Structure formats: C-alpha cells, structure tokens
Amino acid sequence: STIEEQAKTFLDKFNHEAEDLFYQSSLASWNYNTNITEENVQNMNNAGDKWSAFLKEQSTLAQMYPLQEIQNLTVKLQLQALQQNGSSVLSEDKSKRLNTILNTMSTIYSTGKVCNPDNPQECLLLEPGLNEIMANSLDYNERLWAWESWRSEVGKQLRPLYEEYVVLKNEMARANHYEDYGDYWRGDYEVNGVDGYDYSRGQLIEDVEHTFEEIKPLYEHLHAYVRAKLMNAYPSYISPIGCLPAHLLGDMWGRFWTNLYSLTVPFGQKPNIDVTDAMVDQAWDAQRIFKEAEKFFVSVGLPNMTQGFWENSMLTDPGNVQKAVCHPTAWDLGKGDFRILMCTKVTMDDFLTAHHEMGHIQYDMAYAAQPFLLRNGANEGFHEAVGEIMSLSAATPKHLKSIGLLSPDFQEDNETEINFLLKQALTIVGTLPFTYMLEKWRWMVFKGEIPKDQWMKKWWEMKREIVGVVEPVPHDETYCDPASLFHVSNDYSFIRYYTRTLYQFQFQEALCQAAKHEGPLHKCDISNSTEAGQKLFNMLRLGKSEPWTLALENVVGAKNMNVRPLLNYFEPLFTWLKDQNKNSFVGWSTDWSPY
Amino acid sequence: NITNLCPFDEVFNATRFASVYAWNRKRISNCVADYSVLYNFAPFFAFKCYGVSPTKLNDLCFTNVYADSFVIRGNEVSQIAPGQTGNIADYNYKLPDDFTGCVIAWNSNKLDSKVGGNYNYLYRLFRKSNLKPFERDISTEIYQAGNKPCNGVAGFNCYFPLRSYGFRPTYGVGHQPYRVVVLSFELLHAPATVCGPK
Ligand SMILES: *[C@@H]1O[C@H](CO)[C@@H](O)[C@H](O)[C@H]1NC(C)=O
Ligand SMILES: *[C@@H]1O[C@H](CO)[C@@H](O)[C@H](O)[C@H]1NC(C)=O
Ligand SMILES: *[C@@H]1O[C@H](CO)[C@@H](O)[C@H](O)[C@H]1NC(C)=O
Ligand SMILES: [Cl-]
Ligand SMILES: [Zn+2]
C-alpha cells in the first residue's frame, strides 16, 4: 500500500477523533463563556488541554509522511495544516523563554495602569476612563498628556521584552524553512502545487503596495479635509500644510477615526439615519431582530438557521445572575451545532452586529461538509469580509424602509448620503494606512532591514510619510509605540484587517452586478437577489478545500486582490472631498512637527 | 379472521437498538403480516420502498419477512439503499442490488442521546474489503494499514476498526441518531404457509 492510502486512513481517523474532541472543547468553552463559574472554568481548562495534547500527538504522528510522494491536493493541504511542527522546533529552553515573554507581555498590557501627577491616587487603566478621555476629551493638553503617558509607561517596559520576542520568533520561523516570522505570517496566503492559481508569500507585499498606491489619493484628500476641519476645534496646534498630531485622531492609537465625526461632521444640522427610537415604538426585541435577519438571509437564497440555534443560542443577557461575556460571538461547536452569543439590545448597532454574526454563521454552515482541517474560510480575511458585506447591505436606507423600520414618507437626499459615506470612510479607509504601515514596519523588523537602534525612528518616519501623523513630542529610543497596541503585544497578525477590508468591497461590487444594481455602490442591496446568493454560496461552500485565489475568482472573477471596488464605493465622497479640498494645500509636509 | 398478528412493535418499539457492525436480524415467518407501521412515529424521516409499492405491500404474500435493524446518523441514511457508496454501505451494512423491500428510518435523539454523549453505538470505519449483501462481520482485528502486520497491537499504521458515535442532544439534525429498520422480502420457491390479512 502506497503512502497515499496510509495518509488517507490516518486523515479519516484524525477527522473523526478531532471532530469529537473539538466539539467537546467548544462545548466546554461555550459553557464557560455563557456562565462564568469555577466549575465551567475547570471544564474549559481540562477540555482544552486534552484537545491540545491530542492535536500535538497527532501532528507528531503526521510528520512521519514525507509529503513529497503524495499527489492528492486535498490530502496534501490537510497534512500541511496538520504537519506544521510550530513552536516545538526550537529547543525547550527557547520555548519556555518565548512562552514567558508572551505571557508577561500580555499581562503587562492588560494589567497596565498609569499614575498621574494630578493626584497620588488617581490612576486609571486603559479600557475604561482612558479611552473615554481619548475619545471625547476636547482639551489639547489632557489628551496629549494621556497619549504620552500611556506609551511612556507601557512601551518603555515592553521594549526589553520585544527585543527578545523578535529574535526568538525569527529563530523559530527560520528553523521551519522560512525566512523570518514575518514570512511565516505571510504563509497563510501561500498557494502552491496548483499552476494558474499559485501565489507566493513574497507577492503579498508587492500586491499590497500596489493597492496602497491607489488607496493613497483618497486617503490624502480625507486627511486634508480632517485637518482643515480640526483647525477650528484645536487652534494654535495644527499646521495648514503640516501633518496631524497623534493625540488628535480620536483613539489611543488612531486606528479608527470614528470619534472624529463629532468634529468633522459635514452637515451637523441634519441627524444621521438612526432607527433606534423607531424600534422601541414597535416593541422590537432580540428575537424579532434575529428573525428579520433570518428572513433577509433566506431571501438572498441561503439555508435557514438550525433548529438548535434558536434553542441553544443565548441572544439576550439574562442579567447579572448568569454572567457571560457580552461580546458578539459566533459559536460553531461542530457536528451541526451553531449558536450566537450576544447581549442583543434594541439598537441599530445591535441590529448590524446580529446581521454580521448571522452571516458568519451562514459562512460556517456553508463548508460544514468539508473535513475538520478544511472547515475554515479561504484565508484570515474572507470570513470577516463575508460578515461585513451583510451589515453593509443591511444598513442601506432602502432595506430599512422595506422591512418597516424607516418610514415611507422619507426620501434620502445628497446631504445624508455624503454624511454616511464620510462617517464610513472614517473607519474603513481611514484605518487602511495605519494597518498598512504597521504591517510593513513589522515585516521590516522581522526581516532585519531595520537595525535594533533604529526601531522607533523608522516607525515615526514611516508614520509621518504614510499616515501623515506626526509625533507630538520627542520620543527616546527606549520607547515602544508599536507594542502599545493589542495586536502587536499579543502576537496577532494585523494584515488581515487590510486584505479583508479590500475583499469586502471586492465582494460588494461583485454581488451588485448580479443584483442588476442601477445606482451607486453604497446603495446596493443583495436582498431578493437569488443569483448573487447562489454565486456567494458557491464560494462559501468551498471554504479551505480550494485556494483562496480560486475562491475569489468564483465570486469576483479575479484571481488576485483588487482595490478598484474600494475606490468606486467612495467615489461620490471622493468627488465631494475634491470639491471641498481646495481651500488649502492638499498633502502634508513631514518635516514639520509641533515641537 | 385472525390467527396472531406480527410483533412488529418488538423491533419498532425496542428499548434499545443494536450497533451497525452487529446489526440484528429477526426472522418473521409464522405471523400475520399486518403492515401498519404508521403508528410507530408516523412522521417518518425516510419511508422508501424498493421492489414493492407502499400500500399494496399489505396485501401480498411472501416466504420470509426478515427484519433488520440498526442505528446510524441522519446523513448516513442515504447509504442504506440499493447501489450506495460510503462507510456504512460498504463496511457495515450492504443491501443487494435487486433488493425487494422497504427501509424505514426515524429520529431517535431523545432515546439514543445523552448530555454526556452516548458512546454505546459503534461502527466500522476500516476494513480490508467491502462487505457482501446482507453480510455480518463482528471481527475486531487490528486493520493493517501499513506494511507489517503489527503483531495485533494498536499503534502507528495499525488502527482499531470500530469507532464510536457519542450522540449528544446538542448535535445537529445531520449528526443526531437515527434508528433504521429494513423489511426484507424474498420468495424461496416454497409454500408460503402464512400471508397478510385480507
Ligand atoms: C483524493 O482523496 C479524496 C478522499 O479520498 C477523494 O475524494 C479525491 O477524489 C481524491 N483525488 C484524487 C484521486 O486525486
Ligand atoms: C425554514 O423556513 C421555513 C419557512 O419559514 C420553515 O417552515 C422551516 O421550519 C424552517 N426550517 C428550519 C430548519 O428553520
Ligand atoms: C424583497 O421582497 C419583499 C417581498 O416581495 C419586499 O417586501 C421587499 O421590499 C423586497 N426588498 C427589496 C428592497 O428588494
Ligand atoms: Cl503610535
Ligand atoms: Zn466578525
């Protein structure tokens, strides 16, 4: 019997046993999340350790196959996903050291608390209080001091840990036949063994740079507009032709500009489209919202939710007697068990989040007929894109007025359209440069193109050049601004939020063509579009059993990433900004600084 | 008239069914063939007939009325039919190509599922060759997947043939347990001493 038969038998046995054990582990984790108790904590802990040990021993047994004689691409991909040695390649000492470094990084970031000179006992941590200030504080000195102190307190303590983590991850990935940990991360988009759809890790950086080359103009104009609008709220601090401070972006790190809508509102006289009060007047609840989302999803042509979903899923907070995590979560326990954990309130935000979670569950159910090792999205960005396209199509005025939320005696106008487009750009296109520069800096650090004595200098220079955000005060090299972010200190890839942000519009523009849309892309609704629903399901069904490029070709018709749909989405907003971005010089001078 | 009706409820209303690798077979040869299976959970998930129509069944005579029973998953019921491929059809229970009978399957989640997982139902996953029609194999020998015999020990490339199910009430309809029973009819060119009611 050739190695192929042995591999198939081992993969079948592993599929069965891992399905069982992963269902057990997901059930324990769900019981813990839905009810925070020591017993459920112990259940989650023992289930998790047993599942992880089973996976590790199976991977150890899987390494006994050379993988070069096999020809079945499915078995090949399953083994590649199961044969990855991982952190066990390094000696045990490096393993313990890296685990300790990661643990202390995560704890210092979580348990970080900043003491202030205002009072000896007025310390506030990051999540509460500090974010409230960074979001709603209009005082320059207050937010400046907070933004400076958080960094000076966290990055200065994390820098000695990052200096170890970088080199440790570099020596780990390099041992795995990779160039560095940055390349190991890019291995997710790696496609090999299939001519016509292959995709190397190195092509990702080039394609991302090419897409940013086209993203730049719209972001340049948006930044110019935000600057011109911030001069009145923060006078005597902003330059006409210079960059913007880092503590005026609305958040601790400026990842999202949602908090700037209150200051850069084009037309604040007319309020935004909000159906909150319109829901309580009709006595709406979580059940009704989720059933409306169900009717919307099935109208597109997707299967309706499992019976166990409405029975086992907890869609409303039972109160502070069965305590649970209030984060919107999609739970695919496996073996046909799907649930959604969300403290659904009567609000438009909860409506959109429920639509997103239902779309995620639909995606999860699409590829339910695939092996355990292939029961996942095409890549790290496809799932979130499929989940966000639903929230986008649901937030349109036409959909809100078709289901009875928006009154028929109201016709959208250009003012509200521009307002909504700009508010969406604050978070969609306003965060693309941040993610791009962060990922580029991390890649250059992992590759070694940036020496250890030039980390913060190169970071700030790249910030000034790309995002146009200048440093408020001089920063010594002992600082560590990148580590101040959750995804950087917690060892999480950040490029997913860029590729996913592009795939979102790639799918939106690909489904509008099937629905026979006749207006702008931001007014498209895939509701009642059976052809678009089927075209999407034909890709969600594949999951990970096929390359991500082939999956993208099924829906969008293109083999590689494309950003033209993103620009087409904000084309009216782009024209409006160009018409408005003529009172001052467009662009920023990186040589200028507020100090 | 009436002599004595069939104990069909003894197989349709059994406290617990048998596994697939050891599916039971009950010979009904001296009973009045009263086909009133509708009262056993009328909402059948799969009530298909092969070689005979549904209701005309009740007024036809046969020599042997063999009745086979076992439990399988909801998505595996399709494998219980003439000309099917998969794990069950080939390694556990195979039906003849020209099978003349009926196949009744119904959900048994409440009965054959526990909050902790019902691991009492086992099924064969590996076998040297495909089973013949109506073949029964209780062998639990280590399936040789590699090159050496392994000397009869469970290890690398030497896996145990039987696998468990672990039915739970939280499983989906596709994975919930399904009690299936087959009504095999065959004429042996012998005097049919018994028939159905008029
Ligand atoms: C590979 O194996 C899978 C599972 O056995 C099978 O479905 C597929 O057709 C095979 N492909 C080949 C023969 O390359
Ligand atoms: C699917 O939708 C139809 C129509 O609402 C309904 O009758 C049926 O019960 C639904 N099935 C599931 C599994 O929810
Ligand atoms: C979809 O169809 C339903 C029922 O005909 C209708 O009420 C709804 O307005 C339609 N939605 C859109 C915007 O196509
Ligand atoms: Cl920063
Ligand atoms: Zn999501």
Author numbering:
A (entry chain D): 19 to 613
B (entry chain A): 331 to 528
Sentences copied from the publication:
The trimeric spike protein is a major membrane surface glycoprotein of SARS-CoV-2 that mediates the binding to the host receptor ACE2 and subsequent viral entry into cells. The matured spike protein contains two subunits: an ACE2-binding S1 subunit and a membrane-fusion S2 subunit. Upon ACE2 binding, the spike trimer undergoes conformational changes to expose the FP motif of the S2 subunit to initiate membrane fusion that allows the release of the viral genome into host cells.
The cryo-EM density map was of sufficient quality to enable us to build an atomic model of the RBD-hACE2 structure. Briefly, the side chain of Q493R forms a new salt bridge with E35 of hACE2, Q498R forms a new salt bridge with D38 of hACE2, and K417N loses a salt bridge, these key mutations resulted in an enhanced binding to hACE2. The structure of the BA.2 spike trimer with hACE2 reveals an extensive interaction network in the RBD-hACE2 interface, which is also conserved in the BA.1 spike trimer-hACE2 complex. The network of interaction of the BA.2 spike trimer with hACE2 is more extensive than the WT spike trimer-ACE2 complex, providing a structural basis for the high binding potency of the BA.2 spike trimer to hACE2.
